Design an enzyme around this catalytic site. Structure first.
Site, PDB file in Angstrom:
ATOM      1  N   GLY I  29      -1.456  -4.746  -0.747  1.00 16.24           N
ATOM      2  CA  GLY I  29      -0.854  -3.793   0.273  1.00 16.24           C
ATOM      3  C   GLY I  29       0.535  -4.086   0.786  1.00 16.24           C
ATOM      4  O   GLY I  29       0.854  -5.394   0.585  1.00 16.24           O
ATOM      5  N   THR I  30       0.894  -3.523   1.764  1.00 13.07           N
ATOM      6  CA  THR I  30       2.306  -3.797   2.275  1.00 13.07           C
ATOM      7  C   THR I  30       2.197  -4.686   3.320  1.00 13.07           C
ATOM      8  O   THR I  30       1.193  -5.099   3.801  1.00 13.07           O
ATOM      9  CB  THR I  30       2.854  -2.422   2.898  1.00 13.07           C
ATOM     10  OG1 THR I  30       2.171  -1.800   4.110  1.00 13.07           O
ATOM     11  CG2 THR I  30       3.131  -1.326   1.985  1.00 13.07           C
ATOM     12  N   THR I  31       3.429  -5.160   3.662  1.00 12.02           N
ATOM     13  CA  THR I  31       3.246  -6.262   4.455  1.00 12.02           C
ATOM     14  C   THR I  31       3.265  -5.962   5.884  1.00 12.02           C
ATOM     15  O   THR I  31       3.896  -4.857   6.575  1.00 12.02           O
ATOM     16  CB  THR I  31       4.699  -7.220   4.436  1.00 12.02           C
ATOM     17  OG1 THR I  31       5.014  -7.487   3.028  1.00 12.02           O
ATOM     18  CG2 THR I  31       4.829  -8.482   5.130  1.00 12.02           C
ATOM     19  N   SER I  74      -2.973  -4.229   6.694  1.00 11.59           N
ATOM     20  CA  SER I  74      -2.562  -4.277   5.185  1.00 11.59           C
ATOM     21  C   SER I  74      -4.060  -4.125   4.489  1.00 11.59           C
ATOM     22  O   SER I  74      -4.766  -4.882   4.467  1.00 11.59           O
ATOM     23  CB  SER I  74      -1.881  -5.527   4.957  1.00 11.59           C
ATOM     24  OG  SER I  74      -0.542  -5.621   5.949  1.00 11.59           O
TER      25      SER I  74
END
Ligand SMILES: [Cl-]
Ligand SMILES: [Mg+2]
Lengths: 235, 250, 240, 244, 241, 231, 195, 111, 243
Positions: I29-31, I74
């Protein structure tokens, strides 16, 4: 083993696709819609000559304005018919009117995907639901165990379906009379059936606005078979 | 967050075996030796206190358990399974008997209730059998003294004397030679200590052995006076000192 | 509760548990049904591997559902009791609410519906049983004979057989039974039923059971000696 | 989820057999033999114990022969613990019938009920069947003396003489040879013991190996008596018939 | 080999899921020790804060179950907290129902019975933790009772848990062989904590700063954990003699 | 492979294969386009037939006077989810006298889809939805995937060959957003967008399905000769 | 429903039950049969609250007929009466009890004896030589105490019953519109058409 | 004891013409001898060319109208925007009212 | 083998492989980050702009619980929403019974026990999110991070998702260079920088910055989103530091 409601890698439910194979093994049923009425015909397919063929009930009344033909595991259809009859009568009780053909079909199709780990598997039977209402007139619907239904000007289901459907493709036009549609069902049934077509191993029915849903007598169907033979011999 | 194991985990194999019951009996075989001997005027049950560490206080772990004032139990196999069975056995003695009839159940019927609980773990959904065999000694007015064995299947049998667990084959042979129908309770305790010495490796004394009797009524252990009919518990756990006294005359 | 889908579709469109239930029916002792002009006869095989039996108290193969309807079967015996009990209960319930005994078609449709339900309900297997349901509707003299099977399909038959070697007896009936003129009397109908069982049974009279059902709740089971007379007459005519 | 670990105890094989029922019957075939013989004036129940040890307390022991009411008894072959679950249910059914109708339960009705319970475990619930076969010996005023058997399938049948458990093929041949319809209880006692004496896997048949019982309408003034034989009484009938 | 996935018997009479839960116990790589004084029960445990981004005040494996009962856990923190919350609820419910404070040994039995159920019932997994309960019980005095994923429990004169438990265990065994008594003959709890830290240092062979240890103390009518500064005071006293 | 038997199982790389297989059913479905300006929001859907005798399967469903969606994938699952939206819109009206926010409608669909992805026995929904609406903060377009992920967008497309229409909208972004107070020009842009996803077949009178909602425009569906204007 | 009588003679049981059905002000019917055949040799008459009476009688009938099919056997009168009693004793502690009183007249084919059981709505069962429910017994029991003998014929039983009905027609305030009489003996159940 | 009913007064009137119909109601709402409002609408446009009023206990009246309006909405959804006829509306209202047969809506309804 | 096919099964190691597989979804996932400051906490997240057709500022990822707790995560976004929905029910029942708003450590255990419960059975799947959350209570500021196992601790700074190593390095510098502490307004600026620096791991697609904060002085101890001028000031600071 594996889940009953599992998706395949192609994005289809395994059990629904497998039930469609059961329906291909069933006896042929054909429906043709016209502006004068909708005709419903079936192959009876008795397993032995000792079986009293009149007891084979593959065409069924749902209400006065809605008839039904079946193909596949026909025992599975009984609870579907029971639901359709109850839904039709219940709507008349609540609203003092006939229920629309589309709405009835939708109610039957809502049962279809109620399976999991509710009933343990999908239905193994397809239905041709034919009827009349004041809004959309004479209608024919094909109800599958996927929960989907399509309206059709004409439709064949069961073992001879793809062969029958191609024939219905050429023969159907918007100006067909009821008498013409009766003969056309008998013609296409005779083509796809294994045994020779007669009044005892095939059954006709129709739904008109005036007289409602009627299963044809064996004596009445016999005359239409004799009329068909003569008109094919005529050219 | 669902219990979906509504199906049996113990089933018949092609040979007719119930695998999980057999495997439970194997767990019982690995367990420490315990025995029971029946005398004319009493019953004795005994086992080794196999201490898991010398820092552990083995007095706190009771392998020999009072079920009713006249009924006691010992085991071989999985200790935690035994502990929960003792809890359930004590409770069912009240719920299915004492609260109905105003008296404690006879030995055979309490055994029958324990047996039932163990059978159900052999057939019900989502459970394994109990990994223990029990020896239940007791007294009641109309049946007298008795000794019963209960297995993981739920099956139970009455014994004059027997042994279960590690060295049970050797111990049962030793008891066949020594047992007779004219034994006094002291003679049965003496034979129990002799039989148990064979299956023990290390230290053999009152601190490493657990032994209890079903014998005479103990009015001194009752805790109250004034009711002539209530004469006291027949179950008594022998002390560390009482065991050592009999080991000198051994 | 145990919810597991035991009856499911396979890639070729078959429900194997239903088809394997038909194999249990194939294993079961043979049962036959023949309807005459004014009667129906139910013939049943009793396998002679079991002697030292007590024939007074052993469960008979033909069961009365009401005073005017009978049910025989082929397949698992234990399973058949469950269908028979439910059918008997429904027969009394119909009398209670409709004030009229069940038609043979209605009773068949009920039993068939129970069988179907067990092919798409979680946690259950299908019945390993096919039935022959026979009798006369109330105030009616037309004979009725129906057949059901594990899938739940049912249908009416002039004559029919089910169970082990039913292929052979169905062959016999297909050539010997005339629709234009069925067995006119009770004698003729019982004779044709015994004859058809004699193709498979391969023993005298202890292995055949016959039950005659007539209009207006007139049901009677034939004895050993009565059946043995039919067996004697058939083979004496055959020696020619 | 949990589906992975489900044995599926209530399914058909491709041949149309119930796996678990068949495997339960295989279990029962190793259990100690039990024989029932029905005479004109009574019924005999004889059965062989499985666990010969000199230290087994026999006089207080019961693994084979159980009382259901005053008129009906059973001989067990299979798992004893499974049988006791069913026995207690049958004892309750009998008393429910007595409470409702004020008449002792007819033998077949009790047998059917137990057999229906066994059937249920083969068709639904996903549990293993009971690994038990019963011989029912009983009397009622409709059919008189009756012998039945039931097995894990829930099927039951009536018999003049029958065996269950080990060596039934051999036992049933011997019974079929010597049984006659006009036979009496004393003769049936002798037949039961002689049949066990030949079919037994042990070296010799002794009193400490047997459980024995009779149901006679030979009580004082036309009543029915259930006699569960004591060890000394089994020893006496072994000497009388000439086996020891 | 599905007899290794759920809690059913293997052919050897073993429960592999129980055995593998015991191995999860050492996943934290922490060692705990518990000893008894005259008036007290002391429990010490290693504290390891590897990440500088962690708030060290929130990193703990010692739990105050009730006013009288403390619990140290050897095992992963989610299962530790699961066990802690349940023990707290059970201790409170006991007081409400029976009108007195739940004894340490009774709570240990209860939690051990719950652990037993997970070894017998398939749908529940065992918790991968060992629970060491400590108190000064009003009847039995200073008390140490320890529970594991098998549902086994027993009382202890002293105990140790973790990867290097055997080294600590033998160190303690040898001390009690000399003294010939079931406890640390010492009046103040402060000196009993000093004993516990000293004998862990000797057994593990490592020195400790204030932030490397975590300490719990049970006295009559209360259990409490020591702060970093309270431990520092303990470490100074050990070094000065 | 071994980790696709049910929705309760992660694969070794942290994937949920049953959810991804459900996502595949959407790609097999017929194309549908969504787009909006500041004043109006439009759905355009290419309906699919079984054969020449059959009807064309309906793609657009009305949820309230101010909200509705178009579907791609399993139609019965769209019926279940649209019925749920109808009820939630209705609950908001009856209890709070409040038209349900389009953003909140998306949140409810997300959470309903999620529960089917974490529990055993159930399956994910096999359908993707484009929800349009006009609420107190103006025109809105949402995209729903049965993984649970819901996204607010100026424009999008889903179904077979949907990448063609999605690229067109990505170029046209600055033009069609400005089509305010002109419904016919916004529909034109939607019809021109869906045309980029066609191959072989073209837009006929009973093939095309259009819907619109806006400032002084209730959610209304146009089929048959009502869409002949835009062909 | 008002008057139901029963009398057990030498070789039969006779049940007499009134024909009137009255709701409030009007007599709605004067030919009502207040009885159900439970089995070929067992007849149950009934009286009590409207609706409850027939519902209970037909429910018992269905259950006994079910038993008869299942076992291919007729339950003894004693067994049927015990079943009926238990159903009423269960009923009395329900949400809404059955307000129904019954007489059960049967011929036991095993013992070759007539039997008459009187059971009230509470589940109070008694076996009697003669019985009645409601206000009838206040007149009829004293008569039967005078005139009854155990060795009477069926004809003597019918004459003794006429004397009961005459007394009820003389002294009771309600017009019960005569009685339907039924005899239960070894040959089954038959109705006396002229009474 | 708590009384779940009240009386809000008011009066309504329906008259049918040849190609039209009227439904009239007064706008006064009362409890006991107090006036609650001089203008509280009591007759409502329910869609599909149907007007409705449920006069009596105003809380039950509002509840019934609200449920019928919703019934019209769901009739459109479930039956392809079909117009609910006046006869069909009437039968639907019977079922709404009889659904609370043992705890009634205290109103007199006219459509 | 087969130990990784079913949730709640111990492997011979003593590991639950299904939980470790859930961690891979989180790593994908994204930060997202969290920074504990003097009198509060700051949360920030990377939102990948998949297309120009995404409406700016509309697809909000950070979620509020009660009025004082912020949550960011995330991994699988729907699993995060499910966890926040539960968190909201837990906070509501706490406030209903005890009156005071749920303390942050109390709230942390409520989420922790719920996530841990989804590792106890094979009938459920573990959570495919790591969740960074916190706020201000009576005892001051608290920042937490919660993993798929149910494991959680308190933090000075926290980071998860694809850019976590980059972010963790930057957070470690702030802890060393500011022992006396960081202000709330400073923490917003630094949060913007850290997300921009962590974007080098997701550098293909351009992104949108989203920040929120709870601070005793700056927001009265309530959770608010950073908007308008204060957001642009933090973006400008972040853009200046990368160049
Ligand atoms: Cl407990
Ligand atoms: Mg487990």
């Amino acid at each position: 083993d594996r889940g009953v409601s599992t998706f395949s890698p192609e994005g289809r439910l395994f059990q629904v696709e497998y039930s469609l194979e059961a329906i291909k093994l069933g006896s042929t049923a054909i429906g043709i819609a016209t502006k004068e009425g909708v005709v419903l015909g079936v192959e009876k397919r008795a397993t032995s000559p000792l079986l009293e063929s009149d007891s084979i009930e593959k065409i069924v009344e749902i209400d006065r304005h809605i008839g039904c033909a079946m193909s596949g595991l026909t025992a599975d259809a009984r609870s579907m018919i029971e639901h359709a009859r109850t839904a039709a009568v219940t709507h008349n009780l609540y609203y003092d009117e006939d229920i629309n053909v589309e709405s009835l079909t939708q109610s039957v199709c809502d049962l279809a995907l109620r399976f999991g780990e509710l009933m343990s598997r999908p239905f193994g039977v397809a239905l041709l639901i034919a009827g009349h209402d004041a809004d959309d007139g004479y209608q024919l619907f094909h109800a599958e165990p996927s929960g989907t239904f399509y309206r059709y000007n004409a439709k064949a289901i069961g073992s001879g379906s793809e062969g029958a459907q191609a024939e219905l493709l050429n023969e159907w036009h918007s100006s067909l009379t009821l008498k013409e549609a009766e003969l056309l069902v008998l013609k296409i049934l005779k083509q796809v059936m294994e045994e020779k077509l007669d009044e005892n191993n095939a059954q006709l029915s129709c739904i008109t606005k005036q007289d409602g849903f009627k299963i044809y007598d064996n004596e009445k169907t016999a005359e239409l078979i004799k009329e068909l033979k003569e008109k094919e011999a005529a050219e | 967050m669902t219990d979906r194991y509504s199906f049996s985990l113990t089933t018949f194999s092609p040979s007719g075996k119930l695998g999980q019951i057999d495997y439970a009996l194997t767990a019982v075989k690995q367990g420490v030796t315990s025995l029971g001997i029946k005398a004319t005027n009493g019953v004795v049950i005994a086992t080794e206190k196999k201490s898991s560490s010398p820092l552990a206080m083995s007095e706190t772990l009771s392998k020999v358990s009072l079920l009713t004032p006249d009924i006691g139990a010992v085991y071989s196999g999985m200790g935690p399974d035994y502990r929960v069975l003792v809890d359930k056995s004590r409770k069912v003695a009240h719920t299915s008997y004492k609260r109905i009839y105003g008296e404690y159940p006879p030995t055979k019927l309490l055994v029958s209730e324990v047996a039932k609980i163990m059978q159900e773990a052999t057939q019900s959904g989502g459970v394994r059998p109990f990994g223990v065999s029990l020896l239940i000694a007791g007294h009641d007015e109309f049946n007298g003294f008795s000794l019963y064995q209960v297995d993981p299947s739920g099956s139970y049998f009455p014994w004059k004397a027997t042994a279960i667990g590690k060295g049970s084959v050797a111990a049962k042979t030793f008891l066949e030679k020594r047992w007779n129908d004219e034994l006094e309770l002291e003679d049965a305790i003496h034979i129990a200590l002799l039989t148990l010495k064979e299956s023990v490796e290390g230290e053999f004394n009152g601190d490493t052995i657990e032994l209890a009797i079903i014998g005479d009524e103990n009015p001194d252990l009752l805790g109250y006076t004034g009711i002539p009919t209530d004469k006291g518990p027949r179950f008594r756990k022998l002390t560390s000192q009482e065991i050592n006294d009999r080991l000198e005359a051994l | 509760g145990y919810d597991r889908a035991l009856s499911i579709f396979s890639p070729d469109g078959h429900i194997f548990q239903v088809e394997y239930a038909l194999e249990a029916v194939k294993r079961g002792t043979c049962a036959v049904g023949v309807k005459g002009k004014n009667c129906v006869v139910l013939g049943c095989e009793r396998r002679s591997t079991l002697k030292l039996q007590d024939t007074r108290i052993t469960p008979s193969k033909v069961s009365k559902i009401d005073s005017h309807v009978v049910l025989s079967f082929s397949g698992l015996n234990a399973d058949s009791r469950i269908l028979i009990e439910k059918a008997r209960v429904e027969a009394q319930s119909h009398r209670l609410t409709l004030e009229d005994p069940v038609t043979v078609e209605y009773l068949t449709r009920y039993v068939a519906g129970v069988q179907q339900r067990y092919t798409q309900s979680g946690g259950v297997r299908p019945f390993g049983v096919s039935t022959l349901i026979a009798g006369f509707d109330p105030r009616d003299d037309e004979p009725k004979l129906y057949q059901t099977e594990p899938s739940g399909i049912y249908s009416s038959w002039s004559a029919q057989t089910i169970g082990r070697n039913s292929k052979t007896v169905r062959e016999f009936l297909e050539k010997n039974y005339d629709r234009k003129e069925p067995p006119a009397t009770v004698e003729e109908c019982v004779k044709l039923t015994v004859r058809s069982l004699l193709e498979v049974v391969q023993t005298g009279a202890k292995n055949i059971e016959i039950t005659v059902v007539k209009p207006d709740s007139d049901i009677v089971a034939l004895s050993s000696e009565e059946i043995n007379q039919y067996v004697t007459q058939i083979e004496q005519e055959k020696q020619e | 989820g949990s589906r992975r670990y489900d044995s599926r105890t209530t399914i058909f094989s491709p041949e149309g057999r119930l796996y678990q029922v068949e495997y339960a019957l295989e279990s029962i075939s190793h259990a100690g033999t039990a024989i029932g013989i029905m005479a004109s004036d009574g019924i005999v129940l004889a059965a062989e114990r499985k666990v010969t040890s000199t230290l087994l307390e026999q006089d207080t022991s019961t693994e084979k022969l159980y009382k259901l009411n005053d008129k009906i008894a059973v001989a067990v072959a299979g798992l004893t613990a499974d049988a006791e679950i069913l026995i207690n249910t049958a004892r309750i059914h009998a008393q429910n019938y007595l409470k409702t109708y004020n008449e002792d339960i007819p033998v077949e009705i009790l047998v059917r009920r137990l057999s229906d319970i066994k059937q249920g475990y083969t068709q639904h619930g996903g549990l293993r069947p009971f690994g038990v076969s019963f011989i029912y010996a009983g009397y009622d005023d409709r059919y008189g003396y009756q012998l039945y058997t039931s097995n894990p399938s829930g099927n039951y049948t009536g018999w003049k003489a029958i065996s269950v458990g080990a060596n039934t093929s051999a036992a049933q041949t011997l019974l079929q040879m010597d049984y006659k319809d006009d036979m009496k209880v004393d003769d049936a006692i002798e037949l039961a013991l002689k049949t066990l004496s030949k079919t037994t896997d042990s070296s010799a048949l002794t009193y400490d190996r047997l459980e024995f019982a009779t149901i006679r309408k030979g009580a004082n003034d036309g009543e029915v008596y259930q006699k569960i034989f004591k060890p000394q009484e089994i020893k006496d009938i072994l000497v009388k018939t000439g086996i020891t | 080999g599905y007899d290794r996935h759920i809690t059913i018997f293997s052919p050897e009479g073993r429960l592999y899921q129980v055995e593998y839960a015991f191995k999860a116990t050492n996943q934290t790589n922490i060692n705990s020790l518990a000893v008894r004084g005259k008036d007290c029960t002391v429990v010490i445990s290693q504290k390891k804060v590897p990440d500088k981004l962690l708030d060290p005040t929130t990193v703990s494996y010692i739990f105050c179950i009730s006013r009288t009962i403390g619990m140290v856990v050897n095992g992963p923190i989610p299962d530790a907290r699961n066990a802690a919350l349940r023990a707290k609820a059970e201790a409170a419910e006991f007081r409400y129902k029976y009108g007195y404070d739940m004894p340490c040994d009774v709570l240990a039995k209860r939690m051990a019975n719950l652990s037993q159920i997970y070894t017998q019932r398939a749908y529940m997994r065992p918790l991968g933790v060992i629970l060491t309960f400590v108190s000064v019980d009003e009847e039995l005095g200073p008390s140490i009772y320890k529970t594991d994923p098998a549902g086994y429990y027993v009382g202890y004169k002293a105990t140790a848990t973790g990867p290097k438990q055997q080294e600590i265990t033998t160190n303690l065994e040898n001390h009690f062989k000399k003294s010939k008594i079931d406890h640390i003959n010492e009046e103040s709890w402060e000196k009993v904590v000093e004993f516990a830290i000293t004998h862990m240092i000797d057994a593990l062979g490592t020195e400790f700063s204030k932030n490397d240890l975590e300490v719990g103390v049970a006295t009559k009518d209360k259990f409490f954990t020591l702060s970093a500064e309270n431990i520092e005071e303990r470490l100074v006293a050990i070094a000065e003699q | 492979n071994n980790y696709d038997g049910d929705t309760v199982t992660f694969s070794p790389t942290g994937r949920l294969f049953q959810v991804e297989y459900a996502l595949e059913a959407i790609k097999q479905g017929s194309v549908t386009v969504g787009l909006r300006s500041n004043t109006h929001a439009v759905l355009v859907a290419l309906k699919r037939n079984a054969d020449e005798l059959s009807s064309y399967q309906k793609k657009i469903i009305k949820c309230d006077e101010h909200m509705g969606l178009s579907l791609a994938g399993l139609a019965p699952d769209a019926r279940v989810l649209s019925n749920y939206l109808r009820q939630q819109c209705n609950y908001s009206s009856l209890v709070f006298n409040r038209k349900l926010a389009v953003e909140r409608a998306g949140h409810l669909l997300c959470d309903k889809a999620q529960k089917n992805t974490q529990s055993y026995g159930g399956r994910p929904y096999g359908v993707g939805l484009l929800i349009i609406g006009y609420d107190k903060s103006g025109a809105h377009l949402l995209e729903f995937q049965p993984s649970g992920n819901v996204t607010e967008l100026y424009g999008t497309a889903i179904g077979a060959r949907s990448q063609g229409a999605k690229t067109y909208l990505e170029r046209t972004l600055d033009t069609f957003i400005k089509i305010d107070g002109n419904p016919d020009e916004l529909i034109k842009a939607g019809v021109e967008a869906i045309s980029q996803s066609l191959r072989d077949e073209s837009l006929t009178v009973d093939n095309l399905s259009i819907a619109i909602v806006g400032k002084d425009t209730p959610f209304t569906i146009y089929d048959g000769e009502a869409v002949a204007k835009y062909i | 429903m008002d008057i139901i009588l029963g009398i057990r003679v030498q070789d039969s049981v006779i049940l007499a039950s009134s024909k009137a059905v009255t709701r409030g002000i009007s007599v709605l019917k004067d030919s009502d049969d207040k009885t159900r055949q439970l089995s070929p040799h067992t007849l149950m008459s009934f009286a009590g609250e409207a609706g409850d009476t027939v519902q209970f009688a037909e429910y018992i009938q269905a259950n006994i007929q079910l038993y008869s099919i299942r076992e291919d056997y007729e339950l003894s009168p004693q067994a049927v009466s015990s079943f009926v009693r238990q159903e009423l004793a269960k009923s009395i502690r329900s949400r809404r009890p059955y307000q129904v009183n019954v007489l059960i007249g049967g011929y036991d084919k095993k013992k070759n004896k007539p039997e008459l059981y009187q059971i009230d709505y509470l589940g109070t069962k008694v076996e009697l030589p003669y019985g009645a429910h409601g206000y009838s017994g206040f007149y009829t029991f004293s008569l039967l105490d005078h005139h009854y003998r155990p060795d009477m014929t069926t004809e003597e039983g019918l004459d003794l019953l006429k004397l009961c009905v005459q007394e009820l027609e003389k002294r009771m305030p309600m017009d019960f519109k005569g009685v339907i009489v039924k005899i239960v003996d070894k040959d089954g159940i038959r109705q006396v058409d002229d009474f | 004891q708590f009384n779940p009913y009240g009386d809000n007064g008011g009066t309504i009137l329906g008259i049918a013409g040849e190609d039209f119909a009227v439904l009239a109601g007064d706008t006064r709402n009362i409890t006991d001898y107090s006036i609650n409002s001089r203008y509280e609408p009591k007759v409502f446009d329910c869609g599909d060319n149907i007007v409705m009023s449920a006069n009596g206990f105003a809380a039950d009246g509002d509840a019934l109208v609200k449920r019928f309006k919703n019934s019209v909405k769901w009739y459109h959804f479930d039956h392809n925007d079909k117009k609910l006829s006046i006869n069909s509306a009437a039968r639907n209202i019977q079922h709404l009212l009889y659904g609370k047969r043992f705890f009634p809506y205290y109103v007199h309804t006219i459509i | 083998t087969g130990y990784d096919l079913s949730n709640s099964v111990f492997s011979p190691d003593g590991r639950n492989f299904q939980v470790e597989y859930a961690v891979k979804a989180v790593e994908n996932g994204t930060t997202s980050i969290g920074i504990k400051c003097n009198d509060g906490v700051v949360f920030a997240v990377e939102k990948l702009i998949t297309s120009k057709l995404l409406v700016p500022q509309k697809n909000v990822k950070i979620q509020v619980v009660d009025r004082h707790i912020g949550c960011v995560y995330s991994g699988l976004i729907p699993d995060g929403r499910h966890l926040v929905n539960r968190g909201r029910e837990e906070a509501a029942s706490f406030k209903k019974l005890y009156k005071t708003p749920i303390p942050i450590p109390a709230f942390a255990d409520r989420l922790g026990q719920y996530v841990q419960a989804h590792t106890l059975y094979n009938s459920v799947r573990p959570f495919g999110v790591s969740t960074i959350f916190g706020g201000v209570d009576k005892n001051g500021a608290h920042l937490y991070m919660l993993e798929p196992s149910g494991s959680y601790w308190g933090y000075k700074g926290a980071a998860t998702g694809k850019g976590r190593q980059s972010a963790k390095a930057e957070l470690e510098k702030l802890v060393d260079h500011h022992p006396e502490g960081l202000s709330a307004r400073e923490a917003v600026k630094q949060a913007a920088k850290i997300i921009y620096l962590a974007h080098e791991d997701n550098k293909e697609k351009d992104f949108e910055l989203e920040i929120s904060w709870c601070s005793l002085s700056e927001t009265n101890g309530l959770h608010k989103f950073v908007k308008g001028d204060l957001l642009q000031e933090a973006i400008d600071f972040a853009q200046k530091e990368i160049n």
